[model samples]
Target: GVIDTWIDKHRSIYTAATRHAFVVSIRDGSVDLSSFRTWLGQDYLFVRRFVPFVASVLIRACKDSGESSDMEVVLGGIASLNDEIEWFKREGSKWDVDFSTVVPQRANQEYGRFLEDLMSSEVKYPVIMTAFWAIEAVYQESFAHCLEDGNKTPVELTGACHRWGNDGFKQYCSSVKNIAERCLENASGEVLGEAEDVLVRVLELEVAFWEMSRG
Candidate 1:
């Protein structure tokens, strides 16, 4: 049900090729595979397979009485931070200053380390799944704004939500959504619940980020 809602809402943004690729990845099990080498950076196909499931999980968690508290939101924030850091590390490598230089000011450095540890551990899939949910929270909220006002470019739209540099945020958001869908198709109900918990936290963070940015 959540997947249906997500797909209907985002169908306009995804291309036929992108959608088909998503379905195939889910069928092939490529999307469920996670390795440090594979997740160390952002790839378009990867995100497409991962992001939607994240959102759906978070939404479910928010509504579920027995789910973990704010898990989806926390994971979402973590995912957004991770995505930004990787993007800057790759795209801004040539720049004198990189994303790490700015992230400490935005999020706790110690927490970031903990996140890395979690990602590196055997629990990596859940960690990534949670992050996916978080990303979807922000993306869904931000996309609503973009569609309503019709004032920002796709790039600008994602940047407003994720606060990454304008260069790569758009690509990142698009990839996140695509991968999320794939993740949902193959995810078990338990995994989906875990992701939903992450989404709730992500949505909360999205609001805080906007408030801070506005001020």
Candidate 2:
């Protein structure tokens, strides 16, 4: 309910995030290989930053949820990242993406920094989960659009879409949503407001990251 209302209220950012040019181009099979390659490299760097934030989230979830459900969800995230990193590495090689001299763009730099800021001890699990959920939700929503029947996402590139858009990932995102909603149910009004802010920030950053990728 809180997530729905927050998304409804911030529809502009959410829409921009989910339909950013990079995603639309990918769905249409019209993305420039250069742009996609750039994205591949920068996104890999983001994941490097992402792994640690996820670890911090794992710790916070353990402390807050008491129940092991949230821990399992976050732990699964960490476990899969090694494989995720390998996927990126192999994809980069396959795509002729030379990350040997990769430079993070302004948007990506800012986004990774924001994620690091979110890892600060002062932040609560609910607020962190809000960011985590929104981040995955955007990717799932964007890539799922690419995989829709009749979509033009290239055969070779289809795997990239399915990477985040698959049924398994859909299930994971739903589970994270439940965890975030659970946190929202017990969150104070002030914390609720802060969580909403994190959601908006995540959407804005995602849009910017996609803009960078679409270049």
Candidate 3:
């Protein structure tokens, strides 16, 4: 499919985004707790900002989708986010980090700005959807690795890994990707170009986000 083609073409960036040193450390049970704390705090802020982007995509899905199924899938994403935010709060407490006091790092702030730009109605639905899928898919793939057989993931961190690595999130990411690919199928050549560009940009951001967690 169109999404698969993009993934294959940008395999290098995709690998870097999903298999970064930070994620590897987690999978190997060598992650620094301080870095994990930093990630938890910054990601709580990122997820809060992400809700608006997902909501905007839902609005676009309602007006532009070829089928109601697209809207349903995107709407489900918004629903999951409510639980996700609460999960962050619970996890923050477990880690003794206060989300309210955690400042967003430069990379996270840039990512938030990118999402804000995509939220504009002027951006094509396919492009925004592509970005959305790439964003979630990175976490899905990365964390799933930590839960995989033979992984040395720490028991303390397993709960955090399972948050994204669980089967349900894998399915959700797949659903979002399917919707994005369907939308891309009917998109103009120009829009397809933009969507592909957005995918790479998302991969770049994911890499930077993991790097930010490292320090």
Candidate 4:
């Protein structure tokens, strides 16, 4: 709920300027991304700890047949997204980039609040959690590549990030396809549908981020 609240408040701040600054910083090497190293490390920890729980929740929700599984999945996804936003906020300072400067100040503040709400929500489904982990894998892999390449200028970094995104998306999509096909073959229709939907949504978001950066 908090994460949802935060996203609701700050989602509007994802403007062209903010997107441009982020892209340019990567390209021009204006920002020192060393801070992201620790951030990514922390993210890995978080994903490992919570992802399995999410998967468990999904299994229970689906099998229960009485509970609202979709709601649980939605809440879990929102929470995970909020955590990601918070991670970005905390790590942004290390690069001397006040995330607020790039986006709307109000939106930034809301993102934190939104994360809090998301964490408090119920966990009734597990497939949602699996989807979240898949998305996180994409993010972690892409950012790790960025860290490895060292920070570049906005122009130079742009290509690298794009390439990273592309690669991550491809990997994620392939995983999703394989998982979905297997699940269907095994007669796990509900889980397969949920997983496919989550992956589709993730791909949409990833493409949006890259497309926005193009401007």
Among these predictions, the greatest lDDT belongs to 3
Query: How would you encode candidate 1's per-residue C-alpha lDDT over 1-215 as one tens digit per residue?
Result: 45446436445432221211101022253333222112222222233334444444445445441435444443554476556555645544443333333323232333233334334334425435446534443444344444334333221222323343232455555444544555555678887775555444344433333332221
- Give the CA lDDT, 0 to 100, for residue 50 in model 4: 47
lDDT of 4 by residue, 1-215 (tens): 32223224444432221232133334253554433333333333443434444454445445644434444543444465456556555545544555333432233233233323323335213343444444444454444455445444333433334533455445544443343333334435565555445444444444444342242
Which residue pairs of candidate 2 clash? Answer: none
Worst ten in a row by lDDT for model 3: 20-29
lDDT of 3 by residue, 74-159 (tens): 88889999998988888888879998789888889899999998999899888998999999898887777665632554434566
Q: Is candidate 2 or 3 superior in lDDT?
A: 3
Residue 145 accuracy (lDDT) in model 1:
40
- Provide the overall lDDT of each model, using Cα atoms, as 2-decimal numbers: 0.40, 0.82, 0.84, 0.41
Tell me how candidate 4 scores on lDDT.
0.41
Error of 3 at 125 (Å): 1.1
Worst 10 residues of 1 by lDDT: 16-25
Q: What are the runs in model 3 whose C-alpha is more than 4 Å off?
A: 20-31, 149-156
Q: What's every prediction's RMSD, in angstroms?
A: 15.9, 2.9, 2.9, 11.3
Backbone atom clashes (below 3 Å) for every candidate: 24, 0, 0, 31
- Please state the error at residue 105 of candidate 2 in Å: 0.6
Give the Cα error of residue 170 in candidate 3, in Å: 1.0
